[PDB]
From a paper:
Wall teichoic acids (WTAs) are glycopolymers decorating the surface of Gram-positive bacteria and potential targets for antibody-mediated treatments against Staphylococcus aureus, including methicillin-resistant (MRSA) strains. Through a combination of glycan microarray, synthetic chemistry, crystallography, NMR, and computational studies, we unraveled the molecular and structural details of fully defined synthetic WTA fragments recognized by previously described monoclonal antibodies (mAbs 4461 and 4497). By using an integrated approach that combines microarray, synthetic chemistry, X-ray crystallography, NMR spectroscopy, and computational studies, we showed that S. aureus WTA glycoforms bind the mAbs 4461 and 4497 in a cavity formed between the CDRs of the heavy and light chains. The GlcNAc moiety is a prime recognition element, being inserted in the antibody binding pocket, and the RboP residue to which the GlcNAc is appended and both phosphates interacted with the antibody surface participating in the binding.
Interestingly, our structure showed that, besides the GlcNAc, both phosphate groups and the Rbo-C and Rbo-A units were involved in the interaction with the mAb. The GlcNAc contributed to mAb binding through a stacking interaction with residue W33 from the heavy chain. An extended network of H-bonds further stabilized the sugar ring within the antibody. The minimal ligands used in the previous study contained one ribose moiety and a single phosphate monoester, as opposed to the phosphodiesters present in the naturally occurring WTA and our ligands. We did not see the triangulation of the two arginine residues, which was shown to be crucial for the binding of 4497 with the β-1,4-GlcNAc WTA phosphomonoester, as reported by Fong et al. In particular, stable hydrogen bonds, maintained for more than 90% of the simulation time, were monitored between G99 and the GlcNAc C4-OH and the hydroxyl group of Y97 with the GlcNAc C3-OH. Simultaneous contacts between phosphate group 5 with the guanidinium groups of R31 and R34 were established in the simulation. When superimposing the crystallographic structures of mAb IgG 4497 in complexes with ligands 2 and 3, we observed the same orientation of the GlcNAc residue and nearly the same orientation of both phosphate groups. Overall, our results showed that the binding interactions of mAb 4497 with ligands 2 and 3 are highly concordant, with six principal residues (W33, G99, D100, Y97, S31, and N53) interacting directly with the β-GlcNAc sugar.
Numbering used by the authors:
A (entry chain HHH): 1 to 132, 136 to 217
B (entry chain LLL): 1 to 219
Write the structure that this text describes.
Amino acid sequence: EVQLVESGGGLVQPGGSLRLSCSASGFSFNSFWMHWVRQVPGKGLVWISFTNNEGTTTAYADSVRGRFIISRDNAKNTLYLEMNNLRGEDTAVYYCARGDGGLDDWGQGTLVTVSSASTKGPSVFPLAPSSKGGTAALGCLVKDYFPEPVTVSWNSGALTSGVHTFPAVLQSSGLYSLSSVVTVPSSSLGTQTYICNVNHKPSNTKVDKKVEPK
Amino acid sequence: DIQLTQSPDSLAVSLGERATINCKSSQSIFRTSRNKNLLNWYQQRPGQPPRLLIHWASTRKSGVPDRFSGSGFGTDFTLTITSLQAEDVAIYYCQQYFSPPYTFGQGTKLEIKRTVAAPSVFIFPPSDEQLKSGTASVVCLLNNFYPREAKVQWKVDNALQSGNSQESVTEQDSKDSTYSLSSTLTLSKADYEKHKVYACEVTHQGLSSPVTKSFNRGE
């Protein structure tokens, strides 16, 4: 198998509209209820909508009733959420889930940001390992971007052990900043290259930054 | 609308020990015709989508460990987790599936209690590339510590800084049950170039006394 894949999220002006898609595979789509649930970053799960198997029964949370419309295309194995008259309160990660005994096979979610602020891509600066062990730390500072999210991988996903990508913080400017760090064996520093792969899809900003010892 | 209230909001339990999380519904969610209490439990690990553990109040989803068990009737429900494992760090939610809207409880955040672990502390000067842009970010990293409480103080030529730093903390690691923390000191290039000694001083239960990491600008 079961796979749900949400798409269609992004930055949208207040009062604007977005249509989210939830693409289902690996099961008989038309034999199950389907749900939308949202989550404001760092906050709880909030049930938004469901549809029965055929789409003949639907319901909505009080806060979205009359603005959002759930639908399903049983022929195309797709669930939709049409979102109208969007407000700041609608900013959230939107999940689809399959109804079984409970809500199951949740997708990865799609972030919807309701804002009149401009897209801005980050600057990426190295956090270079220094002469001070056994363990060395290095990183990338991803500074001054809007909106969320940014993704950071290391060595194109080959380096995962010891990586900490910090939650973004909102600066006084209203732009976000975050660091991604990794601890590695200090014995590796001579020979191993370390590259942070930063992707800010909202601004089409992709940066591969080599982090070299000083 | 049916309101679900979880208790406690926050729970800290040691590895191998037992967690008890309650969910109270504002009205009965026993569907007489089905002979089922329509209560669901979810686990949401850091950075992950929610995972269904239990539905019908006490029926485990296939593949969920028997360490997770659901109990209760009517308005009062309990999730019990025995033999707590590091990978159980999560926020746990109840949800009613009785009548729409299919409301969630507010969540119970589960912290794993482990042995005290001192942070490894690293300091990073600003990059030459950033300094060209007219700003200096100085970063102090506290890596893999427990418990969460940590004090980070910035000193510039021994003057204690306030109002010009921000901290970020990771969620507890699913393997080693530690936190990491970044503190970023942000100065104009002009202010950065007026001082020599940049120091991050860390206070943590795991350190016999505060640790200072420092550099001299231009070395």
